[PDB]
Amino acid sequence: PPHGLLDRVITNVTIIVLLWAVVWSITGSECLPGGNLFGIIILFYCAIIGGKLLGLIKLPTLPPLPSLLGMLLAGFLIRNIPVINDNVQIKHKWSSSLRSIALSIILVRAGLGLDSKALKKLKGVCVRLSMGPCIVEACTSALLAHYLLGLPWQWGFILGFVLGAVSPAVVVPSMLLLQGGGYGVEKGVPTLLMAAGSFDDILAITGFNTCLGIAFSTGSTVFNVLRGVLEVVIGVATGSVLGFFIQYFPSRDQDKLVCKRTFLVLGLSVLAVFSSVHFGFPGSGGLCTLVMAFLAGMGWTSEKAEVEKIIAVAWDIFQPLLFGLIGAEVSIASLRPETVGLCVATVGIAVLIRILTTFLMVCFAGFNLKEKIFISFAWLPKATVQAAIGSVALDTARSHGEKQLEDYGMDVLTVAFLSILITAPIGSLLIGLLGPRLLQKVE
Amino acid sequence: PPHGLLDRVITNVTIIVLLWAVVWSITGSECLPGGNLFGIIILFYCAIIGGKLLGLIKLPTLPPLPSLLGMLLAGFLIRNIPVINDNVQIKHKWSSSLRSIALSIILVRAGLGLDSKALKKLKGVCVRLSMGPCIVEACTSALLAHYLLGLPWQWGFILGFVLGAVSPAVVVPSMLLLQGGGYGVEKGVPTLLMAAGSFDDILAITGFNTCLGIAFSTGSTVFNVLRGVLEVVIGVATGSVLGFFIQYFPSRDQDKLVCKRTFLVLGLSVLAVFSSVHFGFPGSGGLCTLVMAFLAGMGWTSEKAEVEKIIAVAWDIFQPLLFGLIGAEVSIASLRPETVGLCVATVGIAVLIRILTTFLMVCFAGFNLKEKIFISFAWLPKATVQAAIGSVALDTARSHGEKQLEDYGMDVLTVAFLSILITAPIGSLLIGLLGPRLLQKVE
Amino acid sequence: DIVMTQTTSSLSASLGDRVTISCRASQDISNYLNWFQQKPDGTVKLLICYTSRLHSGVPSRFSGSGSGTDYSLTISNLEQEDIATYFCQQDSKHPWTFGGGTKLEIKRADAAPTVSIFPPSSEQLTSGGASVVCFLNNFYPKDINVKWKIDGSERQNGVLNSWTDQDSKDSTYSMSSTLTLTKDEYERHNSYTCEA
Amino acid sequence: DIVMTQTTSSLSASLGDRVTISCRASQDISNYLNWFQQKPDGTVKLLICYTSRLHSGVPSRFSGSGSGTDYSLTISNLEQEDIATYFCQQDSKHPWTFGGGTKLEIKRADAAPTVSIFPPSSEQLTSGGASVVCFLNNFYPKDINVKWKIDGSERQNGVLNSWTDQDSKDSTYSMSSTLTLTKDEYERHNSYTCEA
Amino acid sequence: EVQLQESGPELVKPGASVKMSCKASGYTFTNYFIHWVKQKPGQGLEWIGYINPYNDITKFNEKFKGKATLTSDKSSRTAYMELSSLTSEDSAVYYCARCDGYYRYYAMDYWGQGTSVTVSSAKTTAPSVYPLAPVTLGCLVKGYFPEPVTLTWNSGSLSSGVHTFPAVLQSDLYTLSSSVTVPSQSITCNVAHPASSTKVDKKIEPR
Amino acid sequence: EVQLQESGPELVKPGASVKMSCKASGYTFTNYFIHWVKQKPGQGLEWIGYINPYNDITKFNEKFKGKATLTSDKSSRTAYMELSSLTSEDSAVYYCARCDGYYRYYAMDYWGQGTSVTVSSAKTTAPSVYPLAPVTLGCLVKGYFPEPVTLTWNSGSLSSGVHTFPAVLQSDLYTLSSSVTVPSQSITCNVAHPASSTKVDKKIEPR
Ligand SMILES: CCCCCCCCCCCCCCCC(=O)OC[C@H](COP(=O)(O)O)OC(=O)CCCCCCCCCCCCCCC
Ligand SMILES: CCCCCCCCCCCCCCCC(=O)OC[C@H](COP(=O)(O)O)OC(=O)CCCCCCCCCCCCCCC
Ligand SMILES: O=C(CCc1ccc(O)cc1)c1c(O)cc(O)cc1O
Ligand SMILES: O=C(CCc1ccc(O)cc1)c1c(O)cc(O)cc1O
């Protein structure tokens, strides 16, 4: 009778084919080569397969390669192989919506995973870590862009801010794994990283918008700076209200408490993210989600474990989609060897300066050498925000119909995709490798 | 602090509003007055509220009114109130797809709930119950249509066959409730009803197609009769293969056995129903689903309880949609008092003859008087197939552009909607009332 | 198809009499012979559905008799409002076909057209065109003949004719005939003679 | 806008010489001055993107010099293939603007047009039309004058002129002048005299 | 009350296309069939086709198959007809009427007002008044593309003999003739062509 | 190989609309910009607008803003352009070229073949040959609507003196004239107007 590897592979192949077949039967034309749903399904499966395959390979002392690399490569190959790309087409609206949902999921997970006492202690350190390295890297990257690539100063800073914020999608899962393992919990390193990795996005996007407006001489800088400040304020206020609400109302004496709480947090986070994006305040949604989830977890205390488990399953489902879509954004047209060497040089030097700055920001915080080194190497990952706003400058330049500005926007896009590819895999691998060693386990 | 009824109502209102808001944020124009998703959401909520409200009322000895009446009335009021109808619009494709999914769910649930030994015993009785009352009611209803309504004979039989098959959507949940309670299990009444209520649909639809072809002198009768026989044969064969497959391959030693089994049964059933409908054999899907689920349950034995639980939750979700959509099909335009009295008379007399025939079919089966009476009163419910093919004759007559045939099709549609409204609520109420009393509990 | 035919296209009727409209189909429509009324201003309203089923809001005068394939519509007494065009429709078969229509015209004593000539003004000669106008007015019934006798010469070409609907105050008719010719044809003739 | 101007619209060139094409913009495009070639059959192919960046597959003869706002294109030696129309484009600003174009014409010894007259045949008189044709052929360069001297009378109207592209075998030119007039104008003249 | 309102008269050029609009108020729009009827001048009516504004199915008279295209929008509660490749034979008044599809004795019973469509080639023109003298007097307005010239006469002439014959096409050249009856002293027709805004008077004298 | 093929020559009437088609093979269709260029005869080219066949965004020259409408379909790998309310000034050859949007020195570097669009009012007509006699001889084909008359001469005349002047518009009446050189015995031009299928010969005699 059936047993062993053959039965498992038969069942998995059957489930995959059956899911596609069911979707095709219900929809029909969407789930066929060229249609949207067929593209989504194929991208999902390819991302999962790539993650697994890359995870398999482990020859050297370094742990198995991160599945992030596999998912990114799957998306990249789907985008760039000619015929596969022609057949597998995903509508932009759907891709953006799925990526937004994945971001909301991970932000909720991070907010739930925070520790109140650690946050109360590492108060200034979080602000420094969130706002120092981003600014310093933006400035140094602008310098490099002006001198090497030849961009003017405004475009240099646009590039520096695009090549800015760290990615919560990469940092949060690894820090949650480490926190579950108990590494660095005594000093609350995972809490510090998870909290700081969700604020610098606001500063990076604010700087990007301001410098873009300066470059195209549109609107005013004061308006964009005030937009950033209002983003912070309204995000905090809305998150606080929602968190204090869901922290009380689904009561401890209801029939399906876990399900209702999970739906409330996830739905409120999705609503915040999408409505804020649609209302012209992209960045208030993430902060509102973080604060809401933090307050809800603080209120629930022990009961939050089941909600965390369900959201972890949701993230397991959604991570392949997010990273496959990010990879599918990358096009080899922008990675032409015309000047790719200089773009790589600027990205590498900016990353080195970012590492040094991050080490100096957490210097006077009570950490020891190993913890500071781990923190510096855990601030590298960049993704899910370089892909979101990488090509905005190029689109604006095209709208203005200026050739020089198109050239500058193309350099910006090349550098964004470079930074993603270079830093996300190495960053995740370094987090995984250096977690157990440098951090101090608590048992 | 929050507690009691007020907290529950606050939470439920919040969840409802939040679900709508999330859908609107993701989609935007769909989930606004006029758009499809807004209509679906409003219909779902209205159906649930109507079911609950109708369930509340219980003055007399009769149990609380069935929620079926509430859901049907909610759909009817949505369809018929002018402004509500204008705002709440559901695309026909979506309505048909949702109803098909609900049918597949209930057929899977019934197939899982069958008992092998009872089916082995009540072998001829099932065939008689499934194919006798339908034929006799079709003939008597055709007689009444010819004499009262004045239809010719071909249209009389088209009407008789439309006013034919019993609805599994109404019979199956009640029989499953009774079987769980242990009523009539010793003689396998629930098994008999659940099995028989899924075959007569094939005969009813076959007769309807044959008589329609005769009326419009299209194709040939031999082709339609052979179509019915092939429906039966290919449905049985496909169901047997699929059941023997899923009965073995998801093995007892896998990590998520229940989830994989549930997905396999539900997905295979949905695929069968939809593909069979799309390939010109509507009726093979239901039989294939029934046989597949029956064989899978027979193979799994005890383990099927969790799958049944999950599918029961799915049915709890989907029943409001199915019945609200069925109600929304009904239009008061067809219920004009021009001749509604005669249509009511024909429906009532046909139902009485059906009751008598059903009592005579199960006469020589080993049941006692109470069991036979309960069975006769449990074969009434009619729905989900009168709404599916009620208006097909009218559409065909309109396509042929004949006034007389349009009149006949309108009479057929009126009688179909009548039969639904008259027989579904009373049938469900009678099943619930007479279950505990007439049937013999086993403990 | 089921092309319908209305026997009379224009029948006179007084203001206090009963009139009948006849519609005959080229087939056997059982009874699906709706009737319609269109007023001169162009507004058309339903009158009688299914042969004799009087519509809601229609005055009781209209009686839609007739059956088989020879249908008819009757007016008890004729009012000034009921002077319009009446169409018979059929929806027995797929392509709905209307009738030719009938116009109700008020009876009156016979009249004689004015038939006055009108020489084109000097502006016509200088402008370049050359149009001669015959104005015969207040005639009854519509039976009129249009012909021009410019300088005795007779042509059967280059004539523009326009009619006036039934007169609402005296129930008469108006005809305007305009002849456009080359200026050279104008130059060789100076006497105007028009026949009607 | 950035309307571009090509100084010379038609410049002669032998089959073994070096030619230069001048394009001047009405602004300061940094270097975005693509060049294009269109052959007489109507097929247009890119030649030089970004002033001097020779395109892939283009023969090495084409050299896209020039910078600032006074660009130019040079041909090392001229082959029979390189006889076509060359356009200078600019994509510095939003609305891309092409130049007026330039046609390369092979040098040759000067020629004299045949300038033969052609009386319309009797079919013309009977048909109704009246067209007189002057056929001056094999002239060089394009500098020609079209005029008709029918019976001494001179008109500046009703003349149809058509030219032939550069001749591929002898590099000459062809002119056809057709005069359409009323038959009456034909009747009063019988001697044909055409000047070129 | 129930009413259907459709677009106003349309001027089109041969080979072009025109979008007719028929919006209805006072009843459930998606509860009725919308039927289109074409009435060529002089000729009788002619059923075109219908659209069900519930599932958006249609049926067309074989004559107008391909020549017409029916569409509807529930939210705007309006229905449109697309006439393609208009020719000289497609210039006529078009009606829209509703019909209850679920009544054993259905009819139209509710019509529009009529949307004239003209398929011609000429452009706008200024009317020219040509006073006529020998009783009666008329000016015989000459060609003008826009039909609604709306010839008028100053107060006093309208007393009697004001027969204003309808404008004729006249080889895509509209000709509207008017006449008056009466002594020698007379008035002038006040042509008020609004399309060209040429309020020409051109008084007629008793020559 | 890379190739863009577009629709063939078109004939339209004033005020109508035309759909241009440009299909490209040999490269990733959604990887490049599709640009449209209109070349009126005698005059130089002039840019119209472009369409990105990835997100379907467009940019139009201010002159053609509203006159043209660009669309594309990835599955068919073709791009279309709509010209609305065509006039006499919209009759010219139309090109489609691709352009790499993500290259710092992008250009077009790949063009279509040209799709002549004619906006006239006349209909098809049969060419009429008018043999001419006094060396040289020509028949002077008269008016005909469809441009591709393709005048021919029987074998032997093509030896020399075969000048065939281009067909002129000539007030919506194409006039293509030919001439031959030579003794008195001659041949006749075999006019082969395919649109009207009038293979007129009309032998010319040495009168
Ligand atoms: C408990 C979790 C709460 C969060 C729920 C979020 C999901 C909401 C479901 C939206 C349903 C979309 C309907 C299809 C769109 C349509 O009709 O199609 C209408 C249009 C797309 O078609 P057009 O582009 O042609 O207009 O919708 C859009 O514009 C957006 C695309 C749909 C959104 C994509 C994501 C849906 C899948 C959700 C996965 C579940 C996530 C939640 C799990 C935690
Ligand atoms: C484990 C259960 C397995 C069964 C799964 C069945 C559901 C499959 C999901 C289909 C997703 C539809 C995408 C939206 C359609 C779209 O893009 O839209 C594309 C079109 C609709 O737009 P148009 O009408 O404009 O073409 O899709 C259709 O034609 C059909 C409508 C979609 C199907 C409706 C039902 C989907 C909701 C499923 C609920 C879950 C049921 C399963 C639980 C047991
Ligand atoms: O993904 C994005 C970028 C979205 C976006 C904002 C503005 C803009 O102009 C374009 C795109 C994003 C945020 O915005 C805010 C976050 O906390 C995280 C995050 O990942
Ligand atoms: O719902 C329907 C009708 C579908 C349908 C079939 C044929 C047709 O012509 C129109 C509609 C249906 C079946 O078919 C078969 C079933 O076991 C149950 C069931 O509920």
PDB file of C-alpha atoms in Angstrom, chain A residues 36-141:
ATOM      1  CA  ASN A  36      -4.458  36.953 -14.272  1.00  0.00           C
ATOM      2  CA  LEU A  37      -5.276  34.117 -11.878  1.00  0.00           C
ATOM      3  CA  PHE A  38      -3.152  31.635 -13.805  1.00  0.00           C
ATOM      4  CA  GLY A  39      -0.230  34.008 -13.422  1.00  0.00           C
ATOM      5  CA  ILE A  40      -0.837  34.405  -9.697  1.00  0.00           C
ATOM      6  CA  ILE A  41      -1.078  30.649  -9.139  1.00  0.00           C
ATOM      7  CA  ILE A  42       2.046  29.899 -11.165  1.00  0.00           C
ATOM      8  CA  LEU A  43       4.009  32.616  -9.385  1.00  0.00           C
ATOM      9  CA  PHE A  44       2.901  31.272  -6.003  1.00  0.00           C
ATOM     10  CA  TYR A  45       3.956  27.712  -6.814  1.00  0.00           C
ATOM     11  CA  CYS A  46       7.241  28.786  -8.386  1.00  0.00           C
ATOM     12  CA  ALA A  47       8.089  30.903  -5.345  1.00  0.00           C
ATOM     13  CA  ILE A  48       7.366  28.018  -2.969  1.00  0.00           C
ATOM     14  CA  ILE A  49       9.395  25.561  -5.045  1.00  0.00           C
ATOM     15  CA  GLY A  50      12.318  27.964  -5.274  1.00  0.00           C
ATOM     16  CA  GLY A  51      12.282  28.559  -1.541  1.00  0.00           C
ATOM     17  CA  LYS A  52      12.343  24.833  -0.838  1.00  0.00           C
ATOM     18  CA  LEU A  53      15.065  24.100  -3.394  1.00  0.00           C
ATOM     19  CA  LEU A  54      17.337  26.851  -2.100  1.00  0.00           C
ATOM     20  CA  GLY A  55      16.714  25.682   1.453  1.00  0.00           C
ATOM     21  CA  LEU A  56      17.884  22.200   0.489  1.00  0.00           C
ATOM     22  CA  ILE A  57      21.412  23.241  -0.495  1.00  0.00           C
ATOM     23  CA  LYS A  58      23.770  23.294   2.497  1.00  0.00           C
ATOM     24  CA  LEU A  59      27.357  22.281   1.707  1.00  0.00           C
ATOM     25  CA  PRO A  60      29.537  24.634   3.796  1.00  0.00           C
ATOM     26  CA  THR A  61      29.648  25.801   7.410  1.00  0.00           C
ATOM     27  CA  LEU A  62      27.161  28.530   6.508  1.00  0.00           C
ATOM     28  CA  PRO A  63      23.548  27.446   7.173  1.00  0.00           C
ATOM     29  CA  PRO A  64      21.198  26.593   4.299  1.00  0.00           C
ATOM     30  CA  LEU A  65      20.651  29.467   1.914  1.00  0.00           C
ATOM     31  CA  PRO A  66      17.632  31.620   2.848  1.00  0.00           C
ATOM     32  CA  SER A  67      14.381  30.827   1.082  1.00  0.00           C
ATOM     33  CA  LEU A  68      14.156  34.551   0.302  1.00  0.00           C
ATOM     34  CA  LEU A  69      16.773  34.059  -2.395  1.00  0.00           C
ATOM     35  CA  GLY A  70      14.765  31.200  -3.870  1.00  0.00           C
ATOM     36  CA  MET A  71      11.521  33.163  -3.985  1.00  0.00           C
ATOM     37  CA  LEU A  72      13.207  36.236  -5.453  1.00  0.00           C
ATOM     38  CA  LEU A  73      14.922  34.124  -8.110  1.00  0.00           C
ATOM     39  CA  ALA A  74      11.643  32.407  -8.974  1.00  0.00           C
ATOM     40  CA  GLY A  75       9.938  35.752  -9.505  1.00  0.00           C
ATOM     41  CA  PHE A  76      12.925  37.065 -11.452  1.00  0.00           C
ATOM     42  CA  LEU A  77      13.002  34.063 -13.783  1.00  0.00           C
ATOM     43  CA  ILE A  78       9.256  34.321 -14.339  1.00  0.00           C
ATOM     44  CA  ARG A  79       9.632  37.988 -15.251  1.00  0.00           C
ATOM     45  CA  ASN A  80      12.685  37.615 -17.477  1.00  0.00           C
ATOM     46  CA  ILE A  81      12.390  34.310 -19.349  1.00  0.00           C
ATOM     47  CA  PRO A  82      10.648  35.346 -22.596  1.00  0.00           C
ATOM     48  CA  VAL A  83       7.863  32.809 -23.097  1.00  0.00           C
ATOM     49  CA  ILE A  84       7.222  32.197 -19.396  1.00  0.00           C
ATOM     50  CA  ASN A  85       6.912  35.959 -18.977  1.00  0.00           C
ATOM     51  CA  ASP A  86       4.517  36.218 -21.914  1.00  0.00           C
ATOM     52  CA  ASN A  87       2.230  33.531 -20.498  1.00  0.00           C
ATOM     53  CA  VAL A  88       2.383  34.525 -16.811  1.00  0.00           C
ATOM     54  CA  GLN A  89       0.906  38.025 -16.513  1.00  0.00           C
ATOM     55  CA  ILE A  90      -0.359  39.492 -13.235  1.00  0.00           C
ATOM     56  CA  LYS A  91      -2.374  42.698 -13.185  1.00  0.00           C
ATOM     57  CA  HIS A  92      -0.582  45.517 -11.405  1.00  0.00           C
ATOM     58  CA  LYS A  93      -3.557  46.179  -9.134  1.00  0.00           C
ATOM     59  CA  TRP A  94      -3.546  42.594  -7.880  1.00  0.00           C
ATOM     60  CA  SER A  95       0.215  42.559  -7.325  1.00  0.00           C
ATOM     61  CA  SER A  96       0.146  45.784  -5.322  1.00  0.00           C
ATOM     62  CA  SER A  97      -2.843  44.613  -3.285  1.00  0.00           C
ATOM     63  CA  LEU A  98      -1.227  41.281  -2.436  1.00  0.00           C
ATOM     64  CA  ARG A  99       2.020  42.962  -1.414  1.00  0.00           C
ATOM     65  CA  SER A 100       0.081  45.411   0.760  1.00  0.00           C
ATOM     66  CA  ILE A 101      -1.755  42.545   2.457  1.00  0.00           C
ATOM     67  CA  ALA A 102       1.524  40.751   3.140  1.00  0.00           C
ATOM     68  CA  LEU A 103       2.962  43.936   4.627  1.00  0.00           C
ATOM     69  CA  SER A 104      -0.074  44.357   6.867  1.00  0.00           C
ATOM     70  CA  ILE A 105       0.223  40.751   8.042  1.00  0.00           C
ATOM     71  CA  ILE A 106       3.886  41.123   8.934  1.00  0.00           C
ATOM     72  CA  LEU A 107       3.314  44.449  10.688  1.00  0.00           C
ATOM     73  CA  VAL A 108       0.553  42.900  12.804  1.00  0.00           C
ATOM     74  CA  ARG A 109       2.831  39.979  13.631  1.00  0.00           C
ATOM     75  CA  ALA A 110       5.638  42.330  14.664  1.00  0.00           C
ATOM     76  CA  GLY A 111       3.354  44.504  16.770  1.00  0.00           C
ATOM     77  CA  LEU A 112       2.030  41.457  18.593  1.00  0.00           C
ATOM     78  CA  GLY A 113       5.556  40.147  19.135  1.00  0.00           C
ATOM     79  CA  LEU A 114       6.807  43.301  20.854  1.00  0.00           C
ATOM     80  CA  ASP A 115       7.646  43.275  24.563  1.00  0.00           C
ATOM     81  CA  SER A 116       6.346  46.169  26.644  1.00  0.00           C
ATOM     82  CA  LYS A 117       9.131  46.196  29.238  1.00  0.00           C
ATOM     83  CA  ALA A 118      11.913  46.057  26.654  1.00  0.00           C
ATOM     84  CA  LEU A 119      10.313  48.921  24.739  1.00  0.00           C
ATOM     85  CA  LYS A 120      10.043  50.890  27.974  1.00  0.00           C
ATOM     86  CA  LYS A 121      13.775  50.391  28.541  1.00  0.00           C
ATOM     87  CA  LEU A 122      15.286  50.783  25.044  1.00  0.00           C
ATOM     88  CA  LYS A 123      13.523  54.073  24.412  1.00  0.00           C
ATOM     89  CA  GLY A 124      16.139  56.434  22.987  1.00  0.00           C
ATOM     90  CA  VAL A 125      18.079  53.581  21.402  1.00  0.00           C
ATOM     91  CA  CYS A 126      15.085  52.703  19.239  1.00  0.00           C
ATOM     92  CA  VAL A 127      14.795  56.274  17.945  1.00  0.00           C
ATOM     93  CA  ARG A 128      18.508  56.464  17.189  1.00  0.00           C
ATOM     94  CA  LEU A 129      18.530  53.105  15.419  1.00  0.00           C
ATOM     95  CA  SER A 130      15.472  54.034  13.372  1.00  0.00           C
ATOM     96  CA  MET A 131      16.431  57.544  12.257  1.00  0.00           C
ATOM     97  CA  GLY A 132      20.243  57.760  12.284  1.00  0.00           C
ATOM     98  CA  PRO A 133      21.469  55.098   9.870  1.00  0.00           C
ATOM     99  CA  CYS A 134      18.792  55.967   7.314  1.00  0.00           C
ATOM    100  CA  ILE A 135      19.824  59.628   7.237  1.00  0.00           C
ATOM    101  CA  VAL A 136      23.553  58.923   7.150  1.00  0.00           C
ATOM    102  CA  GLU A 137      23.188  56.330   4.396  1.00  0.00           C
ATOM    103  CA  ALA A 138      20.984  58.689   2.388  1.00  0.00           C
ATOM    104  CA  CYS A 139      23.584  61.451   2.617  1.00  0.00           C
ATOM    105  CA  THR A 140      26.544  59.225   1.761  1.00  0.00           C
ATOM    106  CA  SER A 141      24.664  57.564  -1.099  1.00  0.00           C
TER     107      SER A 141
END
